[PDB]
Chain length 312, copies 4
């Protein structure tokens, strides 16, 4: 098993670390910046020696070293700094994602690709358009983070472990997010039974939904850097589901093909991951739940189209 990290920044390094702990494969740490992946590869080799992990680790600036990778994780791109519009970020990261898409097609066209670069809803669609890879072999990590935050906040309020708190959240981050209380459960027991027993109020659930929408910006405001540990953990879970053919269930950006009144777009949705890739499944929404999702989908459609134009 060969795991290629396209981008050896904070998230890529931590995904490497978690792939080693968890013994998923040999690592290729790739970056455009001379020396960064070489340095991080040295650090992760020494880490491996202390913790009893025996996988090969290569840090490289040569894109051909991703040859025949089973797994591609794309964190390649920049952060938006002072003087940069959202449109300038989309142009720079979209050009980078186009170039990565071309390299994956050239060197490792049978890879399972996990897109992570921001803005995520857009950059997964950019990867698909320019990769010529099968839609089942592409996904974007997002929904697991939103689900993990929502479930951990519900668990805190009910004074229970988060281990058996499960929820479906459709769409993207922030305003794009569509959480389903009907598909939220605590070790099989619907959330509504806890409301009925006054262990949590509908106002507390609304407050938790707002904290969930805002969590990425809250971490950026406090740490002056975007989340890195939890994104890495979410990516590592998706890798493991593909490699071990697990059919684990996730909300991730996945290709809709008729599902939820949508085809020919990657969007945050209910999916399972196995060794054939990431496969959507449709559940019955109410009319109001589907109207909210269709609005999330229309925004992704609109922003993706704008991004293709910003890329010439």
């Amino acid at each position: 098993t060969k795991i290629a990290l396209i981008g050896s920044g904070q998230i890529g390094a931590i995904v490497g670390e978690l792939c080693l702990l968890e013994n998923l494969g040999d690592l290729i740490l790739y970056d455009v910046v001379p020396g960064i992946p070489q340095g991080k590869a040295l650090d992760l080799k020494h880490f491996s020696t202390i913790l009893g992990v025996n996988r090969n680790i290569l840090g490289t600036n040569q894109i051909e070293d991703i040859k025949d990778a089973d797994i591609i994780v794309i964190t390649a791109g920049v952060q938006r700094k002072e003087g940069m519009t959202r449109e300038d970020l989309i142009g720079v990261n979209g050009k980078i994602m186009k170039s990565v898409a071309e390299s994956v097609k050239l060197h490792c066209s049978k890879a399972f690709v996990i897109c992570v670069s921001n803005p995520l809803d857009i950059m997964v669609n950019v990867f698909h358009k320019f990769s010529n890879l099968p839609h089942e072999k592409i996904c974007g990590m997002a929904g697991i983070l939103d689900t993990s935050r929502y479930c951990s906040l519900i668990a805190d309020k009910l004074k229970v472990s988060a281990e058996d708190v499960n929820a479906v959240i459709l769409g993207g981050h922030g305003d794009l997010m569509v959480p389903l209380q009907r598909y939220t459960s605590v070790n099989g027991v619907p959330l509504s039974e806890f409301v009925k027993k006054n262990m949590i109020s509908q106002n507390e659930i609304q407050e938790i939904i707002q904290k969930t929408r805002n969590m990425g910006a809250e971490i950026i405001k406090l740490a002056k850097a975007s989340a890195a540990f939890a994104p890495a953990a979410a990516i590592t879970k998706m890798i493991k589901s593909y490699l071990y053919n697990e059919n684990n269930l996730f909300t991730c950006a996945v290709y809709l093909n008729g599902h939820y009144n949508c085809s020919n777009l990657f969007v945050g949705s209910t999916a399972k991951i196995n060794n054939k890739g990431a496969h959507p499944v449709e559940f019955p929404l109410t009319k109001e739940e589907q109207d909210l999702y269709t609005e999330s989908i229309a925004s992704v459609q609109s922003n993706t189209q704008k991004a293709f134009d910003l890329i010439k």
Copy 2:
């Protein structure tokens, strides 16, 4: 941390093994049979060395070596063979559980006690009666094992991982068991949505409930021995929830007083486990759900009474 295994048979040894792998504590392996716990302790020490685990393991025939244990697992008992119900065993297992209860009261009255001997819900009530340990410090492992079977079978049929299939199963083993489809979910999605999508039929769910009830007897019939690995894993999860104060959610035999119309009896029910013990919670049941539960509770009540008389 000191984890005392009262019974060094198949389940006790595998609980020891899983506690060493998870690094939960030092072990005391106790058994009435001279040499058995000493030999298994040697084996688990060599296993520890190969796997890089550092915990102490003592095998002993002296029950006072459980002194100041944090955790007690009781498997002291006989098992059922093919042709036998769980419920037949009450006479000899009752006397054994009474004697263990007396020793735990003497030597480690502040331990969290997980009872595993069959018949499970009866032997938990026997342990409470003769130990006088606090009600919340005593439980029985059953519901996690039943739940694991039911969730495995549902996951197989839906072609999904079992990791996010969750269910509430109330009551004891076999006919005593009350699984709740309404409190079964697949990553938050109620089971009933899968029925609606024709991914599983109500007949397939009934057949899975029957396989769940009969699983213990089926394993005994095939393997010529009762289940050991899954019971051990279920016990280890409950241990970890108590030791790390996790408030993990389980169906286990727990003391109900008022919950689900039940007075003053240990029976399989919804609970959480933290470092103060096992705490029951009551959920809103349907009339038919509560009638089935009440029927299971009445059978445990009746058999517990029979057991106290036999003892």
Copy 3:
């Protein structure tokens, strides 16, 4: 990845369990006895669900289910009874291992094969002779058990963790065993420096070597069963080294090909395991160390010849 357990007794089931915990592959539990592997497969599926493991487990009485296995673990064999001579055991387990060797050649000729049946030094040679598999793709598990016991006992006496106590022990179990104090170290520091500092005496080391030779029989005498947990851990380490191409270092039965004045025999020796198999290496022994090893090798040669004749 497909891991085939040929033998679903105590050691095979625990190897299955540890392969699931380490997520090394899908399991095939094979046995000749109807129902045993089916029952244990049910138990290990339930165990998997409780611990969040997602691998396939098949219990089967049909040898063709081992088709294209990556890994074969052979525990197929009987236990020695009082009437049963060493010669009778060799005859029964020898015939079984010949049949397994033929089935592996037919169904999974690309497997890495770990032989575990008694007597270990003979039965690995029997597998090689009748399999027509490459010698690199075969090994026998023994030396790791002796090393774990010797290192645990040295660690106990020095009051240190066993994690960084390492030793080379050549040959087989009991009288076949050739431990090298010169290749024993505590986090890089030779054993002899501890003798020099009077933290351990040469008499204490000899006593530890005798306890190591006798450990198997001691566990049998206490537990009324042979070691199972530690053998399973040793086997799972060897599996992991092959599957993850680790080049981890072991004393295991490995084919010597000029090493230590020996070719054309499997014997316990210094080897590394990677995804191409099990490869010996030779280290410089003193004349006395090599004479002891050559005597162990002559005994394995002699017993293997006897076994081929009995078979």
Copy 4:
């Protein structure tokens, strides 16, 4: 169990992460900079939920939150960049370590303290002087990191796993470092037997020793940041040895009192760690081995005295 991280930078956060994965205890992430530990605590809580870990994590700017901590890890400092020696800072890191020493004495005087700040052997001596903690309750992580690099490189050359390559390295980082070939083994077999069999040459070993000395600076030069993963792993191993009373064997900065001719000083040496702390042991060195060690010790002695002056 309460684990207090004094410093919520790259090493402290990854120590937190590894303590959560290993389930060692509840975490307190402390830092002087408002918001950084709060943001990283949120990230590590979400990480915990995704990986099925249940421990409490508090990020705080209030030093009194370290109260009754069982374990203290000190990374509070500034780091060296390329063009800087370890020993350069050292007035600012010394004042920081003095202030931490005072806080630990006030709030958690029964803690086991692992010092990590950057002139490592000096800052351990500073912590002892101003904390007055018992000598065996104070140590510094260094030797495990140097050992991991040396063992990794020997394992690479012999084409073996690093799992069973073990070595004693005495003294500090860089020129302070004294590796012992005589106390290097591969699964029990002395390194000298590999030289004898021409599997590795004395020149290859010298080159490996030089790469080991320079590795910190090499990673800084390539990754534009100091090593973080392997230091964190080395710290977590020491924490685990104390918490589980393991008597694991390490080189760490430890109080010598006659050992290896060293009087009343913390220096990199052979020690075991159990729940009573870090306990030094002396092995027989040759005259050349002891002369090199005494030279390393004299430099630490000299620089510690200089550091106390820079602190006035």
